[PDB]
Scaffold this active site. Structure first.
Site, short mmCIF file in Angstrom:
data_model
loop_
_atom_site.label_atom_id
_atom_site.label_comp_id
_atom_site.label_asym_id
_atom_site.label_seq_id
_atom_site.Cartn_x
_atom_site.Cartn_y
_atom_site.Cartn_z
N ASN A 247 -13.95 -1.40 -7.08
CA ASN A 247 -15.19 -0.20 -6.79
C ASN A 247 -15.29 0.55 -7.76
OD1 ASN A 247 -13.83 -0.46 -3.86
ND2 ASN A 247 -13.04 1.07 -3.78
N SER B 275 -11.30 -2.14 -0.48
CA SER B 275 -9.84 -2.26 -0.29
C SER B 275 -9.93 -2.15 1.45
CB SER B 275 -8.93 -0.23 -0.23
OG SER B 275 -9.19 -0.13 -1.25
N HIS C 37 -4.00 5.73 3.28
CA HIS C 37 -4.92 4.65 3.04
C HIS C 37 -4.43 3.23 3.65
CE1 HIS C 37 -5.70 1.17 -0.38
NE2 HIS C 37 -6.95 2.39 -0.48
N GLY D 296 -6.66 -8.50 -8.91
CA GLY D 296 -7.46 -9.41 -8.33
C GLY D 296 -8.37 -10.39 -9.28
N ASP E 194 0.57 -0.85 0.24
CA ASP E 194 -0.31 -0.08 0.27
C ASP E 194 1.03 1.39 0.18
OD1 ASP E 194 -3.58 -0.50 1.58
OD2 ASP E 194 -2.75 1.36 0.89
N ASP F 286 -1.34 2.23 18.51
CA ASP F 286 -2.10 0.84 18.42
C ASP F 286 -1.74 -0.27 17.03
OD1 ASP F 286 -5.91 1.46 18.56
OD2 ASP F 286 -4.52 0.95 19.51
#
Length: 266
Positions: free
Chosen positions: A146, A212, A64, A160, A32, A41
């Protein structure tokens, strides 16, 4: 302030967490925009940047990669995360940089690859890299895209769309396909991707929607399976995630359905 994806509960990840299966000793490459390691975190084990203008993989100028990384970790808290920066601040990247990030993942013995990226066209170079990662024992997961619908035509984007790559579509909290989720025969599984609250750069949290956002739920599921079944190949993990789904509608829209990690883990 803090949030966790509602998608953690929806995929049945807490059932493995209570049994002591949290992704321990699994190596996950997030390919990414980088990951903001400074987030309280987030724990980043290492990484690399292939973006000539932005040398630091531990800096996320977009947001992102940090949001995606946070989702991986909410699903599989014990996983060793790797920041593979291939996209710049604008969210764009060259295919060669994407290739170099896949090749880095193979050489560095990554267990799981997450690619919450895609384009309308593929390359021969791009299908050889993804097929080499599957030949090498790697679990390769990507966002379906998308693109919505285009009649009877597949709208799944690359990488994909390649059969070796797990193509993840998006559902909301009620198991309904999101309007934007790409469709076609190449669509494998469904994961939650509507208004996913995760981590953002400089100790922040917020909601994002997309395929995503769906993808990392599957990459974090793969890590949970491998933590319980260390001896299992990438093929076995893929088969278990695909064969144990909660069936939703037509395969063109939903693939095999919604992933069920409790089922998949046996």
């Amino acid at each position: 302030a803090k949030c966790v994806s509602y998608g953690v509960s929806q995929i049945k990840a807490p059932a493995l967490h209570s049994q002591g299966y949290t992704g321990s000793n699994v190596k996950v490459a997030v390919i990414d925009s980088g990951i903001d390691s400074s987030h309280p975190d987030l724990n980043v084990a290492g990484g690399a940047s292939f973006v000539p203008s932005e040398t630091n993989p531990f800096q996320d100028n977009n947001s992102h990669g940090t949001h995606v990384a946070g989702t991986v970790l909410a699903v599989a808290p014990s996983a060793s995360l790797y920041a593979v920066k291939v996209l710049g601040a604008d969210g764009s990247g060259q295919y060669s940089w994407i290739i170099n990030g896949i090749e880095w993942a193979i050489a560095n013995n990554m267990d799981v690859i997450n690619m919450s990226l895609g384009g309308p066209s593929g390359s021969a170079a791009l299908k050889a890299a993804v097929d080499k990662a599957v030949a090498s024992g790697v679990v390769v997961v990507a966002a379906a895209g998308n693109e919505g619908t285009s009649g009877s035509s597949s709208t799944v984007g690359y990488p994909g769309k390649y059969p070796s790559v797990i193509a993840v579509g998006a559902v909301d909290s009620s198991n309904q396909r999101a309007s934007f989720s790409s469709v076609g025969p190449e669509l494998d599984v469904m994961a939650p991707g509507v208004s996913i609250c995760s981590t953002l750069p400089g100790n922040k949290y917020g909601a994002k929607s997309g395929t995503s956002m769906a993808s990392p739920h599957v990459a974090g599921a793969a890590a949970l399976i491998l933590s319980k079944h260390p001896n299992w190949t990438n093929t076995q993990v893929r088969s278990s995630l695909e064969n144990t789904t909660t069936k939703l509608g037509d395969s063109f829209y939903y693939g095999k359905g919604l992933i069920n990690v409790e089922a998949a883990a046996q």
